Amino acid sequence: TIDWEHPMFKLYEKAKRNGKWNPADIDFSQDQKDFASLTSEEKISALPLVAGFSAFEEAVTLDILPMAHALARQGRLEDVLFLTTFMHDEAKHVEMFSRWQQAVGIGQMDLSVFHNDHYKRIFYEALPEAMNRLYADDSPEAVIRAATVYNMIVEGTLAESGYYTFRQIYKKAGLFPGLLQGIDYLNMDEGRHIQFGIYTIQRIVNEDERYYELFIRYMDELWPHVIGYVDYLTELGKRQQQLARTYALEIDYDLLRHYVIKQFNLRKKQISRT
Amino acid sequence: TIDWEHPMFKLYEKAKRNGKWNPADIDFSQDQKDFASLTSEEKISALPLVAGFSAFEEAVTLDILPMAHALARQGRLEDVLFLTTFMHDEAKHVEMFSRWQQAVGIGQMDLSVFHNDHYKRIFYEALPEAMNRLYADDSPEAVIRAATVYNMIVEGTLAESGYYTFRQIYKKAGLFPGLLQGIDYLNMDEGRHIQFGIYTIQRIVNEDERYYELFIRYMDELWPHVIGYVDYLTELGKRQQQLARTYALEIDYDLLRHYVIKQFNLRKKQISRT
Numbered sequence A, B: 001t002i003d004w005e006h007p008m009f010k011l012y013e014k015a016k017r018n019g020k021w022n023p024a025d026i027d028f029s030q031d032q033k034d035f036a037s038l039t040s041e042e043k044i045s046a047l048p049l050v051a052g053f054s055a056f057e058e059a060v061t062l063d064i065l066p067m068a069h070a071l072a073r074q075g076r077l078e079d080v081l082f083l084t085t086f087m088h089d090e091a092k093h094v095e096m097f098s099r100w101q102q103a104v105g106i107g108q109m110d111l112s113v114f115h116n117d118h119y120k121r122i123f124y125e126a127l128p129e130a131m132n133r134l135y136a137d138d139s140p141e142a143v144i145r146a147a148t149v150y151n152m153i154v155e156g157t158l159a160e161s162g163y164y165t166f167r168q169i170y171k172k173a174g175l176f177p178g179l180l181q182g183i184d185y186l187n188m189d190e191g192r193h194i195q196f197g198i199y200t201i202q203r204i205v206n207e208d209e210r211y212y213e214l215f216i217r218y219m220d221e222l223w224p225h226v227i228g229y230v231d232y233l234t235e236l237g238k239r240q241q242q243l244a245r246t247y248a249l250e251i252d253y254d255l256l257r258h259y260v261i262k263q264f265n266l267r268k269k270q271i272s273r274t
C-alpha cells in the first residue's frame, strides 16, 4: 500500500481537510465599490503588489509540474499525492487574483509594467530554469536548488512577506475585504507548500551534510534580487502616498523590509545541517 | 484574465463543486467483516478486479502529468487549471483502493498476478508511451493518441465497465459497502475525466476532419487488448464461482461483455467527424 506514516502522506491528508475553500464563493462586490471609490492615484497604489502575485501564481502552477515528474520518476508516491494538492492550490490562487482583477475592473489592464529587472531575474529565469532542469537532471543538487528557489524564496520569503504587507496595509484601511479573505486562504495553503520544501531540502541534507552548504549558497545567490524587488516596491510606495494619506496609514516600509529580511533568515534556520 | 467561458474552466468549476469527497471519511469496518466472512475461494473472486483498478489508478496519477505539461506549454491555462482537479482526483482514487486493501487485510498481498498480457500491453506500454511522448512531441496526432488511450480507452471503456461490473456483482450481494461508496465517487469523478478527453479530441478533429480517422484507428488498435483482458477476467470469473453461488448471483458475463463493447462504441460516437 501507501506508506500511511510518510510525512508527505500526512501533509496530503491535511491539505484535503484544510483545502476546501473555493474562490468562486468569495463576495467581491464591496471590493468593486472600494476600488471605484478610490482616486486614480489611490487606484495605482495597490496594483504593483497584485501584479507581483498574479504573475507568480500562474508561474508556480505551471512550474511545479517538473517537481512532480521528478519525484514520481523516483517512485516517491506520497510526495506525488501531496503535490496534486499543491498544484490545485496554485490553480485556485491564479483564479482568486483573476476574479478580483475582473471584479474591480482592471482585468483588461496590463500589470507587467510593475515587474522590474530583479523580479524578472527570479520570475523569468531562476524559477523556470531551476524547475525545468528537473526534467533532465534530478540530482540532489538540482532538487535542492528547485525547492530553494520555489518553496524557500518565492513562497517562503516573497509570498509570505506579500501576505503580511497586504494585511499591514489594507486590513488596516478596511479596504478590499474579498481580496483579504482570499489572502487568508492563500496564506493557509502556503504553509503546506513551504513545509514540502523544508521536508525535501532536509531529507537531501540528511544524506550528506555538505548539501547544507549548497542550500545556504543558493539562498544567498537569490537574496540580491529579493531585496532589489523589495526596494523597488518600496520606492513605488513612497512615491505614491495618496492612499496612505487618505486612509491614515503610516505605512512603515522599514518594518516591511525587516520582515522580508526576517522571512529569509528564518527559512534558512528551518534547515538543519545535521 | 482567465477565459471564464472556456469549456475547461467550466469543467474545473464543476470539479471543485463536485470533488469534495475524501477517502479517509469512508467507513470500511463492514468491508473488513465481509471479507473476513468469505471463504478462501470467495476471497479470490474479488481480487482480479481490484488488481486491475489499483494499478491503473496509480498509473494515471503519474501518467497524466505529461498532458498537463504539454497543454501548459501551449498556453492552454484553463485546460491546466482543470487538470489540477484531474490529477488530484486520481490521487484520491489510489488512496481509496489502498485504504480498502489495508482495511480488509490484503495490503501485504501482491495482486500483480492478475495482470495478463493484454492488460500489460495497455498498462506498461500503450498508456505510458503515449503520455510520455508528449514531453517531446505535442503534435495534434500525439495529443489525440494520448487522450484516446487515457481518456477514451483506459477510463472511457475499461474503467466505466469496471464500475458497472462492481455494481452488477457486489451491490447485488450486499457486500463491501465502503468500497461501493468509493466506486460511486470514482464514477462521478470519471465523468469529468472523460469529458476532458472528448473536448481535447474534438477540438483537434475540428481543425482537420482527417484527425477523426486517426482517432477511430487508434481506438481499433487498442480494442484487441481491451477485449483480451475482458475475456481473461471472464475466464477467471467462470472458473471461481463460489461467491456467485453463495450469494445467489447469476453473474451474466455475456451482459458485461456487451457492456464493454457498448462503452467502446459509444466513446467513438462522442467524437464527430465534422
Ligand SMILES: CCCCCCCCCCCCCCCC(=O)O
Pocket: A049, A052, A053, A056, A057, A060, A090, A093, A154, A155, A158, A159, A161, A162, A165, A193, A230, A233, A234, A237, A256, A257, A260
Ligand atoms: C513593499 C514591501 C515588499 C513586500 C514583498 C512583496 C512580494 C510580492 C509578491 C510576489 C511573490 C508572489 C509569490 C507567489 C508564489 C505561490 O503562489 O506559491
Ligand SMILES: CCCCCCCCCCCCCCCC(=O)O
Pocket: B049, B052, B053, B056, B057, B060, B090, B093, B154, B155, B158, B159, B161, B162, B165, B193, B230, B233, B234, B237, B256, B257, B260
Ligand atoms: C468481468 C467483465 C470485465 C469488466 C472490465 C473491468 C476493467 C477493470 C478495471 C481496469 C481499468 C481501470 C482504469 C482506471 C483509470 C482511472 O482511474 O482514470
Ligand SMILES: [Fe+3]
Pocket: A060, A090, A155, A189, A190, A193
Ligand atoms: Fe504556493
Ligand SMILES: [Fe+3]
Pocket: B060, B090, B155, B189, B190, B193
Ligand atoms: Fe480518471
Ligand SMILES: [Mn+2]
Pocket: A118, A228
Ligand atoms: Mn538593482
Ligand SMILES: [Mn+2]
Pocket: B118, B228
Ligand atoms: Mn490473447
Ligand SMILES: [Mn+3]
Pocket: A057, A060, A089, A090, A093, A186
Ligand atoms: Mn500560491
Ligand SMILES: [Mn+3]
Pocket: B057, B060, B089, B090, B093, B186
Ligand atoms: Mn481514477
